Structures are given as C-alpha cells and as structure tokens.
C-alpha cells in the first residue's frame, strides 16, 4: 500500500524530471544554435539569447526539489504543487505541475485544518537528489 504509492509517486515525479530535462536540452540546443548562426540583426539575436538564458535558468533552478508534494482536492482535481508550472500539450495543456507562486496553488499555505479550501489531503515531499526519501501526509476537512 504505502510502498506501492511511493513507487507510483516516484515514477510520476521521474516523468516530470524527464520532461524538465527534455525542455532544458531543447533550450540549450536552441541557445547554442542562436549563438553561432542566428542570422539577421544583432538586436533580435541578443533578445533570443536573453530569452533562452532566462528559460535555461528557470528550468535549471527547478532541478533540485522539483516538487513539494501532492495536493488532492474534493473537486476531483489532481493538482501537483512544485517549483514550476508544467502542462502536457497533447492533453489540452493538462497541468502536470503547478508553481506555488500561482493563484490556483494559493491554498497550499492559506488553507488550514479548520478552514479547508475544498481540499482533501496535503502531502509533503522529503526531496533529496533525484528522488523523494519519503512523504508525510495531513488530512484536512
């Protein structure tokens, strides 16, 4: 039960790392290409360089401690709260991850045991390296 749930969480979070790594690799490839053979006017090249560097930095900072924990809801939603917002494009941009700076992930810190924001269970990830050591849950309602 607990072990199987931990394995499933590890698998999903590993998929999240896979998506992050693929996006970072694509950004690095585009940055390298733009440095050498962009082609055109210097302002557009510099703007592309800056944008790609910003994307690289934002993705790179999220490598460690990518996800803080699951946030189940009574409204039949499966929000994941982490460092960045990630969406599966083929699924009409289904949120695979939500940044806690977003408003939809606001309740993580506002909701309390006696004041639930229609949420069901709040999970804490003890992240270390590329996997979570374990998790501790809290039930709200």
């Amino acid at each position: 039960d607990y072990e199987d749930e931990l394995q499933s969480e590890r698998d999903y979070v590993a998929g999240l790392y896979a998506r992050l790594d693929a996006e970072r690799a694509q950004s690095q490839r585009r940055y390298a290409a733009a440095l050498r053979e962009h082609g055109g006017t210097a302002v557009e090249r510099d703007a592309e360089v800056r944008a790609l560097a910003k994307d690289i930095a934002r993705l790179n900072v999220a490598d460690n401690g990518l996800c803080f924990g699951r946030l189940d809801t009574l409204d039949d939603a499966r929000l994941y709260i982490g460092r960045l917002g990630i969406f599966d494009r083929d699924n009409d941009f289904e949120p695979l991850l939500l940044d806690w700076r977003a408003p939809m992930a606001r309740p993580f810190y506002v909701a309390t045991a006696a004041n639930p924001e229609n949420m069901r269970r709040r999970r804490q990830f003890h992240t270390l390296g590329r996997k979570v050591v374990d998790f501790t849950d809290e039930i709200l309602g």
Partner: protein, 146 residues
C-alpha cells in the same frame, strides 16, 4: 573539510556523464578531483591560478576567451590570445622583502625577481619570497616603466 558558505539557491551542481558511470547530476557522496568546478558557472581565474598552478590558468584563459568567438562565428588562432595571456602573467608579488633592494608590497617581473635573488644569494644570503600574480589588461599596462 573545506567549506563554501554563501552559495545561492539560484545555481545548479556539476555534471560529468561518464561513458559507463551515467552520473547525471552530482548531489551528495560523489567524488571530485582538484580543480574540478563544483557549481555550474564561470570560474574565477585567480582561484584557478591558486588551486592548479600557473600552467592551468594559461589554458583556462585561452579556452574561455576562444569559446566566445568560436561559438559566435569568429575564427582566431590561439597564438594571438596567448600572446596577450603572456603579458597578463609577467609579474610576481612579494610576501615580504628580504636583503634585496625591493621594498615590500610591490609587484615585480620574474626576470627581475629571479635575477636579484640569484645575485643576493651570493653575498646577501636572503632571497625574496613571492608568488605568481594574475593582472588585468589595465593594471598590466599602467605598470610600464617608461
């Protein structure tokens, strides 16, 4: 156990990607050698000079200067860069003045430091002690005797 304190959360760690190791990203318990960069970024030439001697700073400076031109579609031979790098490392700094005429706290060239040490060891018997110093373009230019 050498410590690095003020590292900000805005950076990421070293990568190796050995053919069979498949390290990924070093997090904890990994082993690194002298001179390897720990946190991904731009290293400090002075730190490289201290840790890895004077030869390594030559290669580091030449490679890092080249990379910009190479990645931005410009081809320049390495000899042109290392000519400037040579001037960047002409002088050494003295910890304390010995029997030599030099006053302490001054930067002097090796052609002078070594010569004066060899001349004063014969009679004075107290050659100066010093270490290599890396200088910028401006400081190196302003130090001309003319």
């Amino acid at each position: 156990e050498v410590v690095y304190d003020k590292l900000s959360k805005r950076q990421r760690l070293r990568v190796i990607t050995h053919e069979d190791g498949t390290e990924g990203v070093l997090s904890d318990g990994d082993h690194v050698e002298v001179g390897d960069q720990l946190m991904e970024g731009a290293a400090d030439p002075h730190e490289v000079l201290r840790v890895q001697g004077p030869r390594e700073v030559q290669i580091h400076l030449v490679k890092e200067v080249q990379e910009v031109y190479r990645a931005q579609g410009v081809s320049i031979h390495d000899k042109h860069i290392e000519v400037i790098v040579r001037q960047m490392l002409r002088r050494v700094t003295i910890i304390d003045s010995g029997s030599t005429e030099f006053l302490p706290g001054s930067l002097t060239e090796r052609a002078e430091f070594e010569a004066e040490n060899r001349r004063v060891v014969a009679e004075g018997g107290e050659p100066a002690a010093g270490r290599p110093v890396l200088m910028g373009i401006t400081k190196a230019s302003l130090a001309t005797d003319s």
